[PDB]
Design a protein around this ligand. Structure first.
Ligand code: DGD
Ligand code: CL7
Ligand code: CL7
Ligand code: CL7
Ligand code: CL7
Ligand code: CL7
Ligand code: CL7
Ligand code: LMG
Ligand code: ZEX
Ligand code: ZEX
Ligand code: ZEX
Ligand code: FE2
Lengths: 420, 349, 284, 329
């Protein structure tokens, strides 16, 4: 073999993949194989969780996370967060396993059998990193695919079964969204909402109409942006404000992924709408408020609230930190200024009173799916931030030329005027 | 165009529409496209308003500019300004959209038909349409034909008001209107003698008589301009260039926009209250405004408010654009402004 | 020599006494704001209702405390994660009473820290050297973001954040131990190994070099890498504990054959945690 | 030369003409094939008890309008007729596939009988082709008229099927007793269909008989070309689609409320659409809504494609567009 050793590449075995920078075919094979890995994991974990599923216990008590994602989309669920049959989960897992098989075959084929460098075979598939137009077009194509995917999710929510809306009457129910939001004022109010406790940036969405409309809007934009990238050149200032190499593009992707990971943690930890509490269990706010309300129920049966800093009616104790929390089982007992005591006196329907205790027990011995997802993806996001810094610095230095060390005889610091 | 001194000027894309100032076919194409855009706006906005019409809400409270204008000119309005049948609005908008499609087709046709210049086209009859930015005879004939079209439009309005009727807020219901004709009262509205003020016309009969007069005047002027070459003094006064004619037209349009803006806020007859809303009042702080004269609490603004303010701004900035284009066409280059803070005189032709 | 170009050449210039750079453009105002507010609120600042119970807790020098016991009290429990800008406050005295200065300080300080990391990278670039000092600096950055930002986010309010004071730090440590048993979390064990081993390797390296000076490159690489990796791990451990994913628990593990329970050291540790916890939790 | 994704442009070559013909045959087969296939699935999923405008039945209501298993109204008594029609169409599909394959690889590569053989710039050839197709179309119209005379289609006002005056010259003026999009008389439908069939046959005779005239060769500046002819056809198709969508949305005599649901309201957001005005369950739409909206938007994109092909037919090239945006950076 040639080019698979340190001498012929300069990279130690522990940096072996670096050798793939300019071998287009094998690099593509590696990407395809890795995608196969991801989808294989998806299918295998789905099948595992189905094989260990137990219909009586809740998903969050049972300890399944890939199943809860499908349950949110409503595949084989019923009103009040009840499964009807675990068959569609098996269907999805099997499809993913088969797709993984195909992708792995393609990855092996390009890794070993197929052409090593597509530039030799053709020119549409032969690309060099420092070709700005080619990279623009590839980015555009993949953007178009993402847009089709987002529109597909919206189409499912509108025509094919819909989503499990947990704001349907009498507990959650699988619904088909028919009135998507499209007012641009709503979209701007969502974007320019404060990320702080003063609302929530995008994590504060609470109705499914906004979710479906947002996916519609983003899919349209992704398709349009992909077309734009295919059809135009990078502007001069754009050409002068970036670094054009493989590692630089990798660093940009890493930064984007770090941002997305943090936002996903925020979603899974603060959102009870697009992550229904019926499946992932109660959020920390929901758990605290349910505990407070259940204690209040018991104390009103045997014969505690307070004023907010703005003066509304809220619960008392530590739970005051969750004074603004909104929930499906708690929303009916609302009022113009906080939950009225009179409402709590005689408006507690049985299912809400059952949900309160059921959530009080399962406060995130027992670890909620929210805890697993939040911790894992916070750690992943942090490490991807570190990777973004590493690769961005390396890209900037390598483009400049001083990546492999300072030059002994032309050292730049030796020429600067002493500051003292 | 202007091209101070140096010809063959290079224009960026931001000012890229000045490139075809010399290509007669492309000029035609651009303007047919623009007229297509206007009529498309009319039809599409009519439908867009019909979609969200509420019979319960008063018409002016909701944001409309087209339903009041249609309801004013007959078209399915009952007694007391009631929108009885909402189908004629649909028909009007649909005809406008069809017309827009026709115009846009013609626009693309001319943008791609033949040569950029209409002189070279071998149609041998399209060459009857090639014009120049210097010859006042051809432009006089063009002006005559367009005036003919305007007069024919005013005539059509007179006929439609005579036969189909037209809304009359003073009467309170759609009603045929006799076309008046009193040159004395027309001129008394011209002078604005105390009895008759042009912006406070009270009888639709006077409006109809004035429209009859306008139609007659426009048709006569069109005939005259088609037949008669401009006199020499009009060559002495006006410069002969495209940007100069744009400047003249812009000044005229700015004046007309200001007049219409004042008309909307004040007259109650030709802009009935039930459709457009109560009259406005003109305020002048830093810049002129039209106050709604009504509590905007839980009612937004009347349609008359929007029309009047938008057209005040349209008129004002058409005046400013007229000044800009006249200054250029007369010969003044604005680059000299950069020499302001120096000792060099900020001045040329 | 466009005015904009002249400005850029001024800021991104290696002839200032302290490099500014574009990241330093954000670093300087935020750090100055944080330092000024910290000094002011540490010398004199009213008592803060830390528990959100109308009962205050003082932490300033002019209100009785000294350097060891003084602190800047975290924002009130009632505020939660709400930003509390001065202009969003009912009255200045009230705004102090709820603990706004803590929020001001920590937010400006965190922004300044991340911009300081960026500035480190930028100057490494401007001087022509491999740009990985910032990667090493990212570890203590992660630790501060853990105690000040991520832990309150997981806990729902900034009242659970770390106080800005010497004794406040210890109080935070003991409450954290009570509620999460951090000692028996493997990531903190990695962190302890990291700091102690880093000191060990520093002493060894210094002694060797200063004794003989009267792949060797991999030596310095390992020096740099070891404590940084361990601090990353322990910062991640704190962050995980911010989401109620607590450490190991071996209480009530060995049982007698008949059914009694025999104590182990873990039970003693749990009882100590119990004491710390019951002294916490004002009411229940 | 053309790439694979644009492979059908290769059929534009007169070098391989007959194969081009094959494609069209195949298309029609596919079309009629679907007419079978869809119906079968529909006949599987069609419950008799429920109103016919709830489940995804589009062709079943169309048959119901043409008699075919309806009595006193709201009556379904034999699903065998639908299966018969679907089977007829699907069997015809096999014949059309056979002809498509005969011309695709068995028949001559280029038609150059030769009477069928034509060229893109032979106005007499296209004139006679047009006449023959018009004759067939008018024949189908008259066949529908005969069906009205003998079998008779469902009527809502009469509540039952029934069999059957040219004031069409007034319907064309849309006089207030008109606006054909609101026809409600079977006699009007039958008389107008008789008229259109007669006029189509007359035009077909004329086009076979007489060549294109110079007066109308003046206006057809560029349509004597592949792209031009395709563009004009596409534009005609879009026009027809718009008219059919409006008919489906508004008209109730032809599209009975029983099988199609109530009339649609024309609404406009950024783009036009048709709303149900029916208290159907959330997430469900009447078959009328599906028909009107899908038809309309297909016609809209047919109009866009007509613009594309027409522009390409005249002197315009779209691949120049980025280059322009390159110069004016
Ligand atoms: C180019 C780059 C640009 C960068 C710009 C940065 C601008 C400022 C960034 C601030 C980051 C967040 C700070 C914490 C703010 C906060 O209070 O965060 C809270 C928000 C969510 O807010 C909560 O949102 C909730 C939404 O609930 C609502 O909606 C729910 C839906 O189910 C329910 O209905 C619920 O009942 C209902 O009330 C509530 O509204 C709460 O009041 C509200 O506090 O979390 C979130 O935004 C999730 C994302 C932030 C969390 C983690 C941030 C970490 C930042 C990087 C640190 C590491 C750096 C690497 C080095 C180491
Ligand atoms: C942690 C920070 C980090 C991130 C997140 C990151 N990189 Mg790198 N990275 C690359 C791709 C990459 C991609 C596509 C990518 C995003 O998907 C990332 N990276 C991301 C390649 C281009 C390039 C070559 C990489 C290469 O050739 O090989 C990779 C080397 C090794 C040993 C992989 C083995 C992983 C470690 C054993 C970690 C163990 C984690 C654990 C198993 C998780 C499960 C828990 C378990 C306990 C059960 C690269 C490098 C490199 C480094 C370094 C230091 C990094 N990185 C760092 C990162 C090179 O020297 C090096 C470099 O560039 O030298 C020139
Ligand atoms: C042990 C560090 C390591 C990791 C974990 C790793 N590679 Mg390699 N790796 C590949 C795929 C791959 C995938 C899909 C993948 C995902 O898990 C990895 N790798 C991961 C193949 C495309 C490629 C051929 C085997 C490959 C190599 C190669 C090497 C070397 C030394 C490595 N690697 C090393 C690694 C080639 O010479 C060699 C190389 O780049 O020479 C051109
Ligand atoms: C806002 C004031 C204003 C008005 C209302 C106005 N113009 Mg301009 N205007 C034109 C047409 C025009 C028409 C047809 C028209 C009325 O219908 C107007 N304008 C009106 C184009 C011939 C020409 C370029 C169009 C263009 O830039 O697009 C134009 C200009 C230009 C400007 C500027 C500053 C203006 N304008 C301004 C105006 C060129 O530099 C710019 C210019 O001349 O640069 C050399
Ligand atoms: C009906 C669609 C259409 C519209 C909107 C339209 N034209 Mg034509 N049009 C003309 C003017 C015109 C003006 C001033 C004008 C706007 O008022 C329009 N058009 C508009 C003449 C310059 C020119 C001479 C015909 C003429 O009668 O003048 C003309 C043509 C021509 C045609 C055709 C088919 C058209 N058109 C079509 C249109 C020539 O071939 C024919 C032609 O010569 O193509 C090169
Ligand atoms: C791809 C083959 C196909 C074609 C081209 C087609 N349909 Mg469907 N199609 C409909 C309309 C339609 C129109 C108006 C139309 C042409 O204008 C078509 N279709 C065309 C809706 C009445 C109906 C639901 C709308 C829907 O979501 O599609 C429909 C369906 C449905 C399906 C399926 C599988 C199809 N189709 C398939 C097709 C339902 O499940 C499904 C079905 O049978 O519902 C039980
Ligand atoms: C979506 C708009 C649209 C419609 C309505 C449409 N086409 Mg096209 N279309 C064709 C036939 C066609 C028929 C028979 C037909 C109506 O039945 C249509 N089209 C309709 C083929 C002659 C031709 C190749 C078929 C093909 O590209 O597949 C074609 C094209 C092409 C295009 C494009 C952009 C279109 N189209 C677009 C359309 C080629 O690249 C492409 C083209 O010519 O440039 C390479
Ligand atoms: C490549 C080609 C690219 C072509 C253009 C982009 C196409 C992709 C995106 C199409 C979907 C756009 C959705 C917008 C929805 C919207 O704005 O809703 C919001 C708006 C307005 O909706 C409401 O309107 C009412 C008006 O009274 C209300 O009062 C409000 O104004 C408003 O909320 O909806 C509409 O106006 C409906 C428009 C429907 C258009 C459908 C076009 C579909 C085209 C085909 C797409 C692919 C289909 C594949 C099927 C298999
Ligand atoms: C003077 C001069 C120039 C200037 C030339 C200009 C710009 C002259 C300006 C000319 C103007 C402003 C003419 C305006 C004329 C207005 C007319 C003719 C109004 C007609 C309105 C009518 C007929 C109204 C009709 C009804 C309509 C309405 C219903 C009323 O209720 C009643 C009723 C019926 C009267 C230069 C600058 C170009 C060159 C200089 O050297 C010389
Ligand atoms: C002139 C011109 C051109 C344009 C040419 C075009 C495109 C002209 C457009 C022609 C059109 C659109 C013609 C449309 C004709 C429509 C007809 C004839 C409709 C007939 C409908 C009938 C008879 C309906 C009958 C019933 C049917 C139905 C059952 C009703 O219940 C009852 C009843 C009786 C109404 C070009 C392209 C050549 C060049 C341009 O620049 C200029
Ligand atoms: C073929 C080709 C190409 C061109 C390809 C293109 C541009 C293809 C264009 C495709 C389009 C845009 C197709 C459009 C399809 C339209 C559809 C599917 C209509 C959908 C309407 C639906 C589903 C109903 C929606 C409702 C449903 C419900 C009733 C509501 O109450 C109202 C209402 C009516 C909106 C390229 C670019 C790929 C390559 C070229 O070389 C060749
Ligand atoms: Fe050293």
């Amino acid at each position: 073999a040639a080019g698979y050793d340190r001498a012929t590449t300069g990279y130690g075995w522990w940096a072996g993949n670096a050798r793939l920078t300019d071998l287009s075919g094998q690099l593509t094979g590696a990407h395809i194989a890795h995608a196969g890995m991801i989808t294989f994991w998806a299918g295998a974990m789905t099948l595992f969780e189905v094989s260990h599923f137990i219909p009586e216990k809740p998903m969050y008590e049972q300890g399944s996370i890939l199943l809860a994602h499908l349950a949110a989309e409503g595949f084989g669920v019923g009103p009040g967060g009840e499964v009807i049959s675990t068959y569609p989960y098996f269907v999805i897992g099997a499809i993913h396993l088969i797709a993984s098989a195909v992708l792995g075959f393609g990855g092996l084929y390009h890794t070993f059998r197929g052409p090593a460098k597509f530039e030799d075979y053709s020119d549409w598939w032969g690309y060099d990193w420092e070709d700005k137009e080619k990279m623009m077009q590839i980015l555009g194509i993949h953007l178009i695919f993402l847009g089709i995917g987002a529109l597909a999710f919206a189409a499912k929510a509108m025509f094919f079964g819909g989503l499990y809306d947990p704001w349907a009457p009498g507990g959650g129910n699988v619904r088909l969204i028919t009135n998507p939001t499209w007012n641009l004022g709503t979209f701007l109010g969502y974007i320019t909402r404060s990320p702080w406790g003063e609302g929530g940036w995008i994590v504060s969405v609470n109705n499914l109409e906004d979710v479906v409309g947002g996916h519609l809007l983003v899919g349209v934009h992704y398709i349009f942006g992909g077309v734009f990238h295919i059809l135009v050149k990078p502007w001069g200032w754009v050409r002068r404000a970036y670094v054009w190499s493989g590692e630089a593009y990798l660093s940009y992707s890493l930064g984007a992924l770090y941002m997305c990971g943090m936002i996903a943690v925020g979603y899974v930890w603060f959102n009870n709408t697009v992550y229904p509490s019926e499946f992932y269990g109660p959020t920390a706010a929901e758990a605290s408020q349910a505990q407070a309300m259940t204690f209040l129920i018991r104390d009103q049966r045997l014969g505690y609230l307070m004023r907010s800093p703005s003066g509304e009616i809220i619960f008392g104790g530590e739970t005051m930190r969750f004074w603004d929390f909104r929930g499906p089982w708690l929303e009916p007992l609302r009022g113009p200024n906080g939950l009225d005591l009179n409402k709590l006196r005689n408006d507690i329907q049985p299912w809400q009173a059952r949900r309160a205790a059921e959530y009080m027990t399962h406060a995130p011995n027992y670890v909620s799916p929210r805890s697993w997802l939040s911790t894992s993806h916070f750690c992943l996001a942090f490490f991807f931030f570190v990777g973004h810094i590493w690769h961005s610095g390396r890209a900037r230095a390598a483009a400049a030329g001083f990546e492999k060390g300072i030059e002994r005889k032309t050292e730049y610091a030796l020429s600067l005027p002493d500051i003292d | 165009m202007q091209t101070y001194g140096n010809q063959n000027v290079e224009y960026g894309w931001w000012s890229g529409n000045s490139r075809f100032t010399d290509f007669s076919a492309q000029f035609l194409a651009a303007h047919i496209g623009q007229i297509a855009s206007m009529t498309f706006f009319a039809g599409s906005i009519t439908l867009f308003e019909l979609s969200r019409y509420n019979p319960d809400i008063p018409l002016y409270a909701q944001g409309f500019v087209c339903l009041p204008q249609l309801s004013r000119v007959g078209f399915g309005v009952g007694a007391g300004g009631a929108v009885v049948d909402t189908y004629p609005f649909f028909a009007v908008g649909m005809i406008h959209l069809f017309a827009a499609a026709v115009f846009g087709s013609g626009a693309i046709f001319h943008i791609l038909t033949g040569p950029k210049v209409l002189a070279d086209s071998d149609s041998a009859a399209s060459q009857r349409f090639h014009f120049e930015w210097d010859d006042f005879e051809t432009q006089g004939r063009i002006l005559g034909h367009h005036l003919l079209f305007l007069g024919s439009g005013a005539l059509l309005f007179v006929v439609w008001a005579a036969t189909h009727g037209i809304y009359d807020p003073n009467v309170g219901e759609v009603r045929a209107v006799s076309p008046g004709f009193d040159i004395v009262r027309i001129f008394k509205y011209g002078w604005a003698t105390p009895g008759f003020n042009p912006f406070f016309v009270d009888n639709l009969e006077d409006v109809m008589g004035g429209h009859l007069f306008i139609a007659l005047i426009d048709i006569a002027g069109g005939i005259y301009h088609i037949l008669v070459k401009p006199w020499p003094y009009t060559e002495r006064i006006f410069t002969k260039s495209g940007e100069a004619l744009l400047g003249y037209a812009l000044g005229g349009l700015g004046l007309m926009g200001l007049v219409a803006a004042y008309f909307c806020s004040v007259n109650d007859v030709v802009f009935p209250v039930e459709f457009f809303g109560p009259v406005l009042q003109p305020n002048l702080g830093f810049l002129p405004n039209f106050a709604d004269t009504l509590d905007v609490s839980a009612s937004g603004h009347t349609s008359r408010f929007w029309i009047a303010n938008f057209h005040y701004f349209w008129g004002f900035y058409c005046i400013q654009g007229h000044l800009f284009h006249a200054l250029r066409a007369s010969g003044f280059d604005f680059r000299v402004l950069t020499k302001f803070f120096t000792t060099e005189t900020v001045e040329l032709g | 020599a466009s005015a904009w170009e002249r400005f850029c050449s001024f800021i991104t210039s290696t002839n200032n006494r302290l490099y500014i750079g574009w990241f330093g453009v954000l670093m300087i105002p935020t750090l100055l704001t944080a330092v000024t507010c910290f000094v002011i609120a540490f010398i004199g600042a009213p008592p803060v209702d830390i528990d959100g119970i109308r009962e205050p807790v003082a932490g300033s020098l002019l209100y009785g405390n000294n350097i060891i016991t003084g602190a800047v009290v975290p924002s009130s429990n009632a505020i939660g994660l709400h930003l509390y800008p001065i202009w969003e406050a009912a009255s200045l005295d009230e705004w102090l009473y709820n603990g706004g200065p803590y929020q001001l300080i920590i937010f400006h300080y965190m922004i300044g820290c991340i911009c300081y990391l960026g500035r480190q990278w930028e100057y490494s670039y401007r001087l022509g050297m491999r740009p990985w000092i910032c990667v090493a600096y990212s570890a203590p950055l992660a630790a501060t973001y853990s105690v000040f930002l991520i832990y309150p986010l997981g806990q729902g309010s900034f009242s659970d954040g770390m106080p800005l004071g010497i004794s406040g730090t210890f109080n935070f440590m003991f409450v954290f131990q009570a509620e999460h048993n951090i000692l028996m979390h493997p990531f903190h064990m990695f962190g302890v190994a990291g700091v102690l081993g880093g000191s060990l390797f520093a002493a060894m390296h210094g002694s060797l070099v200063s004794s003989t000076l009267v792949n060797s490159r991999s030596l310095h690489f390992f020096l740099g890498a070891w404590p940084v990796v361990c601090i990353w791990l322990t910062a991640m451990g704190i962050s995980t504990m911010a989401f109620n994913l607590n450490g190991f628990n071996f209480n009530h593990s060995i049982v007698d054959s008949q059914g009694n329970v025999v104590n182990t050291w873990a039970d003693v540790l749990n009882r100590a945690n119990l004491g710390f916890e019951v002294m916490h939790e004002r009411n229940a | 030369e053309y790439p694979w994704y644009s492979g059908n442009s290769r059929l534009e070559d007169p070098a391989v003409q007959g194969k081009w013909l094959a494609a069209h045959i195949a298309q029609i087969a596919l079309i009629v094939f679907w007419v079978g296939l869809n119906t079968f699935s529909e006949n599987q999923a069609f419950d008799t008890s429920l109103p016919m405008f709830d489940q995804g039945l589009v062709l079943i209501p169309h048959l119901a309008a043409l008699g075919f298993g309806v009595g006193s109204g709201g009556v379904v008594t034999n699903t065998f007729v639908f299966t018969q029609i679907g089977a007829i169409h699907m069997v015809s599909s096999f014949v059309l596939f056979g002809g498509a394959y005969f011309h695709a690889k068995i028949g001559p590569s280029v038609l150059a009988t030769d009477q069928f053989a034509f060229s893109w710039d032979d106005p007499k050839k296209l004139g006679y082709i047009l006449g023959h197709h018009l004759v067939l179309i008018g024949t189908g119209a008259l066949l529908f008229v005969l069906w009205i005379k003998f079998h008779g289609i469902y009527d809502p006002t009469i509540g039952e099927v029934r069999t059957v005056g040219d004031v069409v010259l007034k319907y064309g003026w849309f006089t207030p007793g008109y606006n054909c999009f609101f026809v409600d008389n079977l006699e009007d439908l039958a008389s107008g269909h008789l008229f259109i069939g007669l006029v189509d046959i007359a035009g077909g005779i004329f086009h076979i008989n007489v060549a294109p005239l110079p007066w109308s060769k003046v206006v057809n500046k560029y349509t004597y070309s592949p792209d031009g002819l395709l563009g004009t056809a596409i534009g005609g198709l879009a026009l027809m689609g718009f008219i059919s969508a409006y008919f489906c949305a508004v008209n109730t005599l032809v599209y009975p409320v029983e099988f199609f649901g109530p009339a649609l309201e024309v609404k406009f957001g950024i783009a036009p659409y048709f709303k149900d005005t029916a208290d159907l369950a959330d997430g469900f739409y009447t078959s009328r809504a599906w028909l009107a909206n899908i038809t309309y938007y297909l016609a809209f994109y047919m109009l866009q494609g007509h613009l594309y092909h027409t522009l390409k037919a005249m002197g315009f090239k779209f691949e120049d567009i980025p280059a322009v945006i390159a110069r004016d950076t």
